[PDB]
Amino acid sequence: MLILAIISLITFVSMSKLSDNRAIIRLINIYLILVLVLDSFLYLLFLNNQTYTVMGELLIFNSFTFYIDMLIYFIMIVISSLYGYNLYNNNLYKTLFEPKKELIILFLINILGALLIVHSNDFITLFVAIELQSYSIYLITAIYNSSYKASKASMLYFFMGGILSILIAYSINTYYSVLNSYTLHSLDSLIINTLDLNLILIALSLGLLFKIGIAPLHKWLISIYENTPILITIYISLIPKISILSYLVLSNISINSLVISILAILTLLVGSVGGLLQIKIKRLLAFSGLTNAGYMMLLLLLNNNEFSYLYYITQYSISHLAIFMIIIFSIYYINYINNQYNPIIYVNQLKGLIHDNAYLVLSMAIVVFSFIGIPPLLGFFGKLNILMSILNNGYYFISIVLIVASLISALYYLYLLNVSIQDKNNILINSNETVSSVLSYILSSLIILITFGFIYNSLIIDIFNVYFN
Amino acid sequence: PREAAAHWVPFEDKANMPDNVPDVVEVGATSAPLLSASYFIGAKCKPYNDDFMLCREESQGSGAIDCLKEGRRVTRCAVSVIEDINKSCLDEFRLHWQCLEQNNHQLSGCRKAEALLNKCVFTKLNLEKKIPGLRPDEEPVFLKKDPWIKPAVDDFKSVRAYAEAKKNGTL
Amino acid sequence: AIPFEALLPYGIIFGLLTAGGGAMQVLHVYRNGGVRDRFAIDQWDSQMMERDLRLNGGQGRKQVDQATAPEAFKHNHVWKSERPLI
Amino acid sequence: MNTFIIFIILIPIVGFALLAVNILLAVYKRLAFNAAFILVAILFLPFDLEISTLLPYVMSIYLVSNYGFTIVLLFLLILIIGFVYEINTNALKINKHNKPNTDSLIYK
Amino acid sequence: LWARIYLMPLLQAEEDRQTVRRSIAQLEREKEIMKGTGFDVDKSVYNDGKFHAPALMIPP
Amino acid sequence: ALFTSLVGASGLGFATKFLSNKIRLKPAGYYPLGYVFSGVAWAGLGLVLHNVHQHSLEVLEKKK
Amino acid sequence: MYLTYYFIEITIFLAILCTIFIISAKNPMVSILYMIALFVIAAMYLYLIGLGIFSLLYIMIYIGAIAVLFLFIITLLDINSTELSVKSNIRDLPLVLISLIVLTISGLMIYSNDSILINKLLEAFGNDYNTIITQDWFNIENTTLLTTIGNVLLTNNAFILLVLAIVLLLGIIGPISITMKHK
Amino acid sequence: SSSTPLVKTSVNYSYGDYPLIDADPHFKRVVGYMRPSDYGVIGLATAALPAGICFAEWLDPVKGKFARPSVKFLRVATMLGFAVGFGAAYARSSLRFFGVTENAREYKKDEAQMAARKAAGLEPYGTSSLTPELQEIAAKNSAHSIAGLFIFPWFNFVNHPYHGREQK
Amino acid sequence: TAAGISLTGGRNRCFSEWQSFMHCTAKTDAKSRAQCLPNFEDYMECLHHTKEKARLREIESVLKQKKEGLEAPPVKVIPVKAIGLV
Amino acid sequence: MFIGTIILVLSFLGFVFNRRNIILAFICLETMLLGINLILLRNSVLFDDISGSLFAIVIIILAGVESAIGLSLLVSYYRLRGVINSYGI
Amino acid sequence: INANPGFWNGPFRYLRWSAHNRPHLFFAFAIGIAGPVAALTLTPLRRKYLYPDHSPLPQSYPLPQRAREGLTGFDD
Numbered sequence A: 001m002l003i004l005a006i007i008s009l010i011t012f013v014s015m016s017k018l019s020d021n022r023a024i025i026r027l028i029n030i031y032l033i034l035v036l037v038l039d040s041f042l043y044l045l046f047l048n049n050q051t052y053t054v055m056g057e058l059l060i061f062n063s064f065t066f067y068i069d070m071l072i073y074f075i076m077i078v079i080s081s082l083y084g085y086n087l088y089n090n091n092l093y094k095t096l097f098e099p100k101k102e103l104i105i106l107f108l109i110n111i112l113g114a115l116l117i118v119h120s121n122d123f124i125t126l127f128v129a130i131e132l133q134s135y136s137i138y139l140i141t142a143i144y145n146s147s148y149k150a151s152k153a154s155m156l157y158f159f160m161g162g163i164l165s166i167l168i169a170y171s172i173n174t175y176y177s178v179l180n181s182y183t184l185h186s187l188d189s190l191i192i193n194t195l196d197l198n199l200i201l202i203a204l205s206l207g208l209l210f211k212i213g214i215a216p217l218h219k220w221l222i223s224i225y226e227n228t229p230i231l232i233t234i235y236i237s238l239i240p241k242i243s244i245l246s247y248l249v250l251s252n253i254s255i256n257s258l259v260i261s262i263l264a265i266l267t268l269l270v271g272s273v274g275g276l277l278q279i280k281i282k283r284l285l286a287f288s289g290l291t292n293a294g295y296m297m298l299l300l301l302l303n304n305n306e307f308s309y310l311y312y313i314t315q316y317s318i319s320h321l322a323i324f325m326i327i328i329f330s331i332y333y334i335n336y337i338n339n340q341y342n343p344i345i346y347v348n349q350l351k352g353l354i355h356d357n358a359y360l361v362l363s364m365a366i367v368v369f370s371f372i373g374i375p376p377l378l379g380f381f382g383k384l385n386i387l388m389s390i391l392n393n394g395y396y397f398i399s400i401v402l403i404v405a406s407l408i409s410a411l412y413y414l415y416l417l418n419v420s421i422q423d424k425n426n427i428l429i430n431s432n433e434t435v436s437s438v439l440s441y442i443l444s445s446l447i448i449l450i451t452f453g454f455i456y457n458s459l460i461i462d463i464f465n466v467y468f469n
Numbered sequence B: 001p002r003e004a005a006a007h008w009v010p011f012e013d014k015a016n017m018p019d020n021v022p023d024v025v026e027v028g029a030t031s032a033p034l035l036s037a038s039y040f041i042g043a044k045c046k047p048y049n050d051d052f053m054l055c056r057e058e059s060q061g062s063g064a065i066d067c068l069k070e071g072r073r074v075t076r077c078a079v080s081v082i083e084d085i086n087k088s089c090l091d092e093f094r095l096h097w098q099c100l101e102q103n104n105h106q107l108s109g110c111r112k113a114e115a116l117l118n119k120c121v122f123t124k125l126n127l128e129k130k131i132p133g134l135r136p137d138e139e140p141v142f143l144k145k146d147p148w149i150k151p152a153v154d155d156f157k158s159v160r161a162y163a164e165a166k167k168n169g170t171l
Numbered sequence C: 001a002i003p004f005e006a007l008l009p010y011g012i013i014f015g016l017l018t019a020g021g022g023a024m025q026v027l028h029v030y031r032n033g034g035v036r037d038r039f040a041i042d043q044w045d046s047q048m049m050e051r052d053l054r055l056n057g058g059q060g061r062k063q064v065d066q067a068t069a070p071e072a073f074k075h076n077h078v079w080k081s082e083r084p085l086i
Numbered sequence D: 001m002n003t004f005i006i007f008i009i010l011i012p013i014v015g016f017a018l019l020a021v022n023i024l025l026a027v028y029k030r031l032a033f034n035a036a037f038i039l040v041a042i043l044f045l046p047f048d049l050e051i052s053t054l055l056p057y058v059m060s061i062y063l064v065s066n067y068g069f070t071i072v073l074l075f076l077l078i079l080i081i082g083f084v085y086e087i088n089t090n091a092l093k094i095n096k097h098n099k100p101n102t103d104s105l106i107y108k
Numbered sequence E: 001l002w003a004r005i006y007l008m009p010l011l012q013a014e015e016d017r018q019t020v021r022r023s024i025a026q027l028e029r030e031k032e033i034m035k036g037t038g039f040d041v042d043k044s045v046y047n048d049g050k051f052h053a054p055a056l057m058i059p060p
Numbered sequence F: 001a002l003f004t005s006l007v008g009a010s011g012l013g014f015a016t017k018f019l020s021n022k023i024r025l026k027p028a029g030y031y032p033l034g035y036v037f038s039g040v041a042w043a044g045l046g047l048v049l050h051n052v053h054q055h056s057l058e059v060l061e062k063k064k
Numbered sequence G: 001m002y003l004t005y006y007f008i009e010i011t012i013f014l015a016i017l018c019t020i021f022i023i024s025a026k027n028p029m030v031s032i033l034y035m036i037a038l039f040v041i042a043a044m045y046l047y048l049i050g051l052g053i054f055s056l057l058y059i060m061i062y063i064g065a066i067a068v069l070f071l072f073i074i075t076l077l078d079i080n081s082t083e084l085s086v087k088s089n090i091r092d093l094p095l096v097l098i099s100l101i102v103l104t105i106s107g108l109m110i111y112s113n114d115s116i117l118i119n120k121l122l123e124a125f126g127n128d129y130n131t132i133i134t135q136d137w138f139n140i141e142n143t144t145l146l147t148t149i150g151n152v153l154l155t156n157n158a159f160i161l162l163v164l165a166i167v168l169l170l171g172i173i174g175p176i177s178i179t180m181k182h183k
Numbered sequence H: 001s002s003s004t005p006l007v008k009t010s011v012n013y014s015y016g017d018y019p020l021i022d023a024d025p026h027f028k029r030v031v032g033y034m035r036p037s038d039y040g041v042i043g044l045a046t047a048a049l050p051a052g053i054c055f056a057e058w059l060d061p062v063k064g065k066f067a068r069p070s071v072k073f074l075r076v077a078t079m080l081g082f083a084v085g086f087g088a089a090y091a092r093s094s095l096r097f098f099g100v101t102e103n104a105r106e107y108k109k110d111e112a113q114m115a116a117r118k119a120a121g122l123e124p125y126g127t128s129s130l131t132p133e134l135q136e137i138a139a140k141n142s143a144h145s146i147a148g149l150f151i152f153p154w155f156n157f158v159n160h161p162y163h164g165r166e167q168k
Numbered sequence I: 001t002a003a004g005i006s007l008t009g010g011r012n013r014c015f016s017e018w019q020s021f022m023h024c025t026a027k028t029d030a031k032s033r034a035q036c037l038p039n040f041e042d043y044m045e046c047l048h049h050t051k052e053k054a055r056l057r058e059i060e061s062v063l064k065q066k067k068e069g070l071e072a073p074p075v076k077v078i079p080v081k082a083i084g085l086v
Numbered sequence J: 001m002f003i004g005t006i007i008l009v010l011s012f013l014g015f016v017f018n019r020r021n022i023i024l025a026f027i028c029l030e031t032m033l034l035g036i037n038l039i040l041l042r043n044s045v046l047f048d049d050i051s052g053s054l055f056a057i058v059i060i061i062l063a064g065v066e067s068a069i070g071l072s073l074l075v076s077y078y079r080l081r082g083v084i085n086s087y088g089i
Numbered sequence K: 001i002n003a004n005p006g007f008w009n010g011p012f013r014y015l016r017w018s019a020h021n022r023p024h025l026f027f028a029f030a031i032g033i034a035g036p037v038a039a040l041t042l043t044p045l046r047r048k049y050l051y052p053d054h055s056p057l058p059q060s061y062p063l064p065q066r067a068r069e070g071l072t073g074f075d076d
């Protein structure tokens, strides 16, 4: 029911004016809510990890894919509930964060492109769907055309995504050259012994992986994330990561991979030591994206990674989403506003935030402790369940470097708190206008998931046991 | 099952059928006669052709080497039909495929010598054209009157022979 | 009334294409030995025309007819070799 | 040596001859643009290229009876809504400032 | 269409026996090549023993 | 028990409404019917997750 | 008659030559002119291998639309460009001389299935053997290539044509998403 | 002849605790066998989208003042509410064919109608205007397309032989 | 998908060995696939003709050294306008 | 596979080692897709199937829409600036 | 001047408006909607009343499903 939305709304947005864009996005938000509420009984289809192949060996519908398929709609409701809703009703807050006319179209075209990878079986559905979502990132980036950094960022992302798309197509063509089939189950565990496939299957992996930020090629993505406006980048940092990582994790084509193990170590090294001396907040935040997307090639090395992956992905998506929404709240209290597209740029700028309000720093403190794995929080059990699989299957140096990477990373997570609880000299005594109700209720709910998800941890393990085994 | 190359180089082999496959009486008919006599060798040699394709089916991959016995017998009976149609109706058979050698060998262009040949063979050789798979209340196309698709030039000798067959009353 | 000087160019163009196409049909019938051309050629029909060239002996589409084959017809059958296509 | 290939070898010779007789006989010796001009060619390509997605159906129209029909109909009906997007948004029309905005004369 | 399928098994049998004859001729020619130095001319490069026409010949 | 599993999720809902008031710099009881809204919504989530866990346990019971 | 033999290796040499003239040219239009030369050398190879249909599809869309598109862009835009000077591009030579060797040899490695790493490479060149073409009389109607593409895009892979609709949709929405400036 | 399956297919392979009728239901059958509690879900979804928009602007208004949204958006809300209601309707009613929900009053009706057209001598499912290869391909497309209701709508309109039933 | 569809819509040149291997894997419990291996080796050699290439290399290696060359019924090459000349 | 690998490798190094203009990047990217096609289509011929040709006729389309998208991205980049630089974006 | 009344402010009056003032979008959308709407309503009327569908063509050699009863004849 994405395309039932897209085909309808594209005719609806073609005729509506520029003032109607907010209420269009509000409509699409409520539509996605009711698709999640009235249609989420399709979990009953699987009961014992039952998998369906639909459209004729072309799509693959199982329950891992159903969970990612539900996760993406949930985070899209949280993202679309930002563009729909005003932050404050002021002159500044109308000229900041303006949604373009075609933006709401490109989100749902990207979700179509992201869902048709996690659900994908054939290589041609893989290739058409990485193309659909890569175009949508080319155009979600460039839709704020009257920005110098955003246009330079879209033009860089174009050529780098183009090289990695031709590398993937070369690997797909090459696997076709050595075996007649395109589907991954033509492997069926007898090929791989009697066939040198390691080089093909890694080059297929590394083609997607380098699109996401695998760390010899991490420098271009950090530049694109720092250059886009602060609301394009929460979406274009969440979506391609989780979509292809659940692809590469559903179809375990690189087990024991030495190239993947090296680049996993190199990711955990250079992310945690790259974020150390950095003064821009989206930078710091994107290398926190990099180390956490490098607790991913680890599970990609494993076999049977569907508790560790799924728990850590919904952990990371809530935590990610919440801390971007915290600094989007934090821009009202700062003293200096530059650069209309990207209003807070430096982490020096959110000083003394506890003297402005204390509960936004309470929220910020629980999310930044959830990134560094503090045990009564939901972000802890993600690293715990990665480590119950890394050590389960023989990766011992990987475990030590995982630990050292977590410790070096916490040093620049805690810089956010070191800045935000300090004396400011100019405290707020009375704000005349208050922040939007629903858009702060969303962050309060995303906190209370993080701080109280260990309550339901045990239910999730039993549910999981039934529905994936 | 494959279309030829950039630079394909033709070759033959001056050799012999080695020891145990006997000599056979192969069809020396060109495209026009066996396209003309196709329904009649399909009507007489139905179970032999059926038997050969069945034997080729059951020996999967054995195939070529397996049913030498039996593609021997479809050739013999097809040669039998075309010798019989020679000695039966050489003149009207010849009329039909001298028609059908023009018109791209389109069957559409030669109804007139066709119906004459079909009378001749149904009389002497008592074999009949059928288009199978054709459910009733559907007229077979080589029986209908005033078709939409008419040829460019009706050839002359079949005009004359069909008119004389009208005058004699054999048609 | 009608102008003749206006219609003589189109008369020449018409007559040029007319005499061209007439010459073309005669050249095609002379090459094939008195029969019209095959305009749409199947893979089946191409294999069949090659077999006819093999059967009749040398000439293109002579379309001979015989009760059996000659003894040379059994031995003249060809296979086509083909380069590596690197 | 068939009769197709002398023609497409022989024509570049005819062009080279008509060119060499010209070299023999002759005498010898950024501005800003509108978005519509760039957009006609940029947008021409996704409408030229559905045509070649339409080219394999038109050859095999008999085989895919009653089913490839509906697939092609749905393909075209998904393309028509992007067409009606661009014609609802007045995409190709180029505008100018010739109107005096027709504001009534207000006094005092 | 029905005319072509009536003509199919006849030409099929013809190409069948040409396949058998020219194949066994290539096998015997390669046998007379490989006399002396010990090497199997008769063992096929398949494992399921069937009759494949050869391919990939030596450039004439 | 079903009842404590409702009351705890309703308490999570009261915490959501409370913390959402406190980010907006409102008092604790600002719109005191909104506590009823959030309590009923999160309690309904507890209903859903409770019933999914029930049915999953019964599916495990039927495998013997 | 064996003048007509080396036709494939000829076009391979011409493609090498033509890309050397892509990446070493003065004007930005001279490079796309050798690029349409490269498309037509490719289309000659595609006819040569046995695919007459594709060669003309490559002429229709690759010296068709996207050619005209690039020629068009280079016309109505100014683009500064330097020349291939030795003082700015000889520093890249010892990396190119490594990456040529490594990328070519490794791109010729994966067509093989042994595990020696020298018998893998030597199966790419050790193929001078002529495939034998038999006539099978099993096919009755001229289902050529384009018929089978129209049967597989429309029945077996109808979803790929139907997602493809969304991709061409996006290729229409995108340039209007950008280049309009509504109101 | 146009009703022979000639592929191999699982027989009575139930997807839940209840016995399946049907592996893909034809669209007319799904609209036939749906309960009144299902038309309920359609009505609740047509009611929940315009009331949902008016509620969600009662929370925070668009222009700072609480005004009702225009009738223009209420019409589109009613349309997409029928869209969600029909998606949930087809989705529920075809879970009942798979034997994954409670399957009591439809197994009897599918005894009844299949037995009532075995008596009239015609095909148990119906004669399509397709060759049997197109029936196989067109029902490999429409097999289990109700998963992926979150992405795309796809339905059965093909009327092919096999449905995972006992004999044919 | 388009599993074994040919250029002309039929079957590939290696469809039989693949269908034999899928018969093998259909009746075989997982981790009992070692008995399934010879059908697979037949299929990979159908695709790439590797063992046939090595065998013809060894036959040509013994052939090419000898001064006698060829004492066998030879393989005669013809030009394309002379398929059925004699 | 020689002509495809050569177009791919040499087009790739023509992409990597430019510093002079922006359009050589676009046209080297386009000839890489050509180089992938030249390998795929011959594997379709030599294996006797259309399914490599299926991926070919799909990637023709994706190369097309890729060019349409990316040249609209360039006109975005040029509208706001004055002249596309020599050294790059 | 002729302005837009709206499709929602009276449908049939709007179609009457668009037939006069925009015939390049009425008689273009009305000739293309008369195809897939007539394909759902005019086809069973034909299959019952004008003529039923045709028999399908053969595609390959039609193999039967028998077990080779032994043929007699054409031995030598």
Ligand SMILES: CCCCC/C=C\C/C=C\CCCCCCCC(=O)O[C@H](COC(=O)CCCCCCCCCCCCCCC)COP(=O)([O-])OCC[N+](C)(C)C
Pocket: A036, A037, A040, A041, A043, A067, A074, A306, A307, A310, A311, A314, A315, A378, A449, A452, A453, A454, A456, A457, A460, A463, A464, A467, F009, F041, F042, F044, F045, F046, F048, F049, F052
């Ligand atoms: C009335 C609604 C009002 C509007 C609300 C809108 C959106 C609400 C969205 C999300 C709320 C949280 C629901 C979580 C469902 C998890 C299902 C599941 O644990 O998944 C398991 C497998 O997971 C996994 O592998 C691991 C996931 C690990 C999750 C880590 C964070 C969890 C901690 C907090 C989450 C629970 C908080 C409960 C709050 C009362 C599969 O089981 P399933 O797919 O059958 O469950 C869905 C059935 N369903 C659709 C009917 C609900």
